């Protein structure tokens, strides 16, 4: 059809490793032990202060580790022999990772003493109420078994449903369904996972705001928006992911609440009674995650991240790693109580006062192969267009002007005065990376070279240097 | 997970959940496998001592 495009491009955005050469230098690193021990159901604030007493630590929450890295230039040089800051600049490629997650079993679990339910609609022996009071009961549920992992080098964008423009044109407003508008925004640490009831804010979307667990009520729930994140032709929001999840129907329930929206009335033959009316329609699945299978996991397995998708193919940009882990499969919840006295032979709510905690273990190990990027002036021309501040941070591709004069005017407002001057107003604010909540991970000083002392080093060699030294052991172990 | 020393965050007190503090020690003969509330002492942590078998 007539006559499109035919295309004149005429400049083209290129892949970033076609002039990149690897180096055989290997640095190892790894964390001491990541541990957070919190409350699974809800956060506990102190009863006399604003701040937390026990935070919320559940595996049904996004665990976002913000890994901040230096550059190799800003770090070690073994030997100088082909390295000139002129000819090339150096960049980290983390070529292997281990995500540790060996801990005891438990489940992620949430619940609400005011969880809505009319009757049971998996099967029913009677005819449900037209409206009624106090049809809500203490029910608890997990949202679904959720394993996901994704690794990137820029903050990762999730989708959620926000409260859009209430229409007067489509007549979408409260007293009828609220509006839903799909808004992308960045996912956080302590951001909630998808509830099986859509991934959405429920703070302004729920005007009862006791329909569901309270932890999601106040927070935004998000689903990783995979399709937009790989649409990006740079591919630095993410470059690996996998997931495993399970949700089957534990039982259908009906939400108490009747619609104030129209129902056609040619779809049922009117009866006699209140069976010449339709009762509640607002049916929901209740999620399930009953069967734990700790034989299958997407964890306790290294992630060999030797290359990346996109124009990026194993170069950290922004010198960042963003890793999002949700794991509900082995996430231990523990039970204990404190006694008021063991002399009292009761087991009241104020005697032995029951409790539950959650203990959450992860561990991160790295191995970093060195790389170099040859820079010619045309290569620099693209890299500044890609983000000038790479060239700045390295401090090659910045040599000068700019600028840097003039002038200071004066002469003279000493005396007088206009007023007076003043100087000079320097924040807000760096940094734009940290403008969102994260499990802060400094990695800038744990760089090594050992590979036979870390077990991660030994498994790496088993793939690579060949080396390890292997069996391991084998043959036969079942 | 052992019984911990009292912290600000969580202390060994009524009205307040005890801290869980990690004790590593060698596997005894006849030591139990997990419960599904994990590896912990329950002798001390469960004051009531009637929550689990």
From TrEMBL, chain A:
Q: Which SUPFAM superfamilies does the UniProt record give?
A: Group I dsDNA viruses
Q: What's the main place this protein lives?
A: virion
The Gene Ontology CC terms held by the record are: host cell nucleus; T=7 icosahedral viral capsid
Q: List UniProt keywords, sorted A-Z.
A: Capsid protein, Disulfide bond, Host nucleus, Host-virus interaction, Late protein, T=7 icosahedral capsid protein, Viral attachment to host cell, Viral penetration into host cytoplasm, Virion, Virus endocytosis by host, Virus entry into host cell
Which GO annotations describe the biological process of this protein?
A: endocytosis involved in viral entry into host cell; virion attachment to host cell
Listed GO MF terms: structural molecule activity
Subcellular localization: Virion; Host nucleus
**Assigned protein family:** Belongs to the papillomaviridae L1 protein family.
Q: How the protein assembles, per its UniProt entry? A: Self-assembles into homopentamers. The capsid has an icosahedral symmetry and consists of 72 capsomers, with each capsomer being a pentamer of L1. Interacts with the minor capsid protein L2; this interaction is necessary for viral genome encapsidation. Interacts with protein E2; this interaction enhances E2-dependent replication and transcription activation.
Task: Describe the task this protein carries out.
Answer: Forms an icosahedral capsid with a T=7 symmetry and a 50 nm diameter. The capsid is composed of 72 pentamers linked to each other by disulfide bonds and associated with L2 proteins. Binds to heparan sulfate proteoglycans on cell surface of basal layer keratinocytes to provide initial virion attachment. This binding mediates a conformational change in the virus capsid that facilitates efficient infection. The virion enters the host cell via endocytosis. During virus trafficking, L1 protein dissociates from the viral DNA and the genomic DNA is released to the host nucleus.
Question: What name does UniProt use for this protein?
Answer: Major capsid protein L1
Origin organism is Human papillomavirus type 16
Its encoding gene is what?
L1
